[PDB]
């Protein structure tokens, strides 16, 4: 089947065998939890549609990829603008990861959505991760062997340590889904807003972090020996506050 949401519509979503992060469905901020007493209203279905990032290439040597939300969507039409022209904001998402392969391809991905995924820096000593590298945008972050710049600002490349000192394989404690090519070829996660406060500065704080690690290497005898992984994200109950003048 196909999930048409807004002016966007993604085919191949099918049935609803997706995971709902922590069992809580994305909801609008209730007045009881609200920060400034209550706001008259915040109903806007304008930012609620599907933004499909460029498909990443999964090769026989791919070690992993990760994106951070809301960061990844900072440049996605309405949502992007909204979060740029507002001081505070909160949002849930419906991440949809799917890859095209055949019955002659084999491989497995772990698609996990990690809350407050605080990355660890690459080097030893008194170093820390720099702003630019945890905010790669929709491009995401690919695990590479090549040497990079402001090295002491760079985050770790140890994917098997979840990029934060924990063991991959325990990463299943977070809302996730496995993508076993011979069984399924897509996964879906519906996550609500998660933070210790009602809303926040989307610019400085990334609530969720989408991680994708190939637990079982991709193998195939096809001419081109790589397949694409397509990611579609859709904001859920997005709300904003402290709007500022735009086009100024």
């Amino acid at each position: 089947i196909q999930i048409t949401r807004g002016d966007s519509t993604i085919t191949s979503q099918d049935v609803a065998n997706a995971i709902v992060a922590y069992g809580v469905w994305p909801h609008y901020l209730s007045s009881k939890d609200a920060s400034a007493i209550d706001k008259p209203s915040q109903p806007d279905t304008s930012s609620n549609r599907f933004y499909t990032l460029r498909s990443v290439t999964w090769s026989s040597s791919s070690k992993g990829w990760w994106w951070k939300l809301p960061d990844a969507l900072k440049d996605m039409g309405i949502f992007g603008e909204n979060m740029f022209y507002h001081y505070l904001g909160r949002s849930g998402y419906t991440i949809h990861v799917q890859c095209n392969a055949s019955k002659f391809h084999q491989g497995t991905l772990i698609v996990a959505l990690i809350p407050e995924h605080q990355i660890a820096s690459a080097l030893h000593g008194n170093v820390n991760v720099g702003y630019n590298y945890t905010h790669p945008g929709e491009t995401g972050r690919e695990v590479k062997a090549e040497t990079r710049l402001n090295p002491d600002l760079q985050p770790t490349e140890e994917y098997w340590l979840n990029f934060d000192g924990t063991l991959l394989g325990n990463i299943t404690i977070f809302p996730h889904q496995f993508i076993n090519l011979r069984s399924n070829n897509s996964a879906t996660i519906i996550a609500p807003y998660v933070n210790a406060v009602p809303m926040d500065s989307m610019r400085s704080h990334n609530n969720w972090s989408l991680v994708i690690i190939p637990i079982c290497p991709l193998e195939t005898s096809s001419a081109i020996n790589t397949i694409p992984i397509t990611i579609s994200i859709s904001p859920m109950c997005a709300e904003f506050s402290g709007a500022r003048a735009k086009r100024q």
Binding site: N100, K103, S222, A223, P228, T230
Partner: protein, 59 residues
């Protein structure tokens, strides 16, 4: 009559390329159809310009 600034566009893009197993044609064709809907309608008949007859039509 066709307009450019008053006309829409239909664009087709690769979200991903063609994925195929081994021993399979590396390329595939795509077809495109078009028809009007229930609300489609025409008015004020004129002569088609898609057919210009400049011949004998000898019997």
């Amino acid at each position: 009559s066709p307009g450019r600034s008053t006309s829409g566009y239909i664009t087709c893009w690769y979200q991903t390329r063609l994925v195929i197993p081994p021993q399979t044609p590396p390329t595939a064709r795509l077809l495109c159809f078009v028809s009007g809907c229930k609300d489609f309608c025409l008015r004020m008949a004129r002569d088609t310009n898609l057919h210009l007859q400049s011949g004998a039509i000898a019997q």
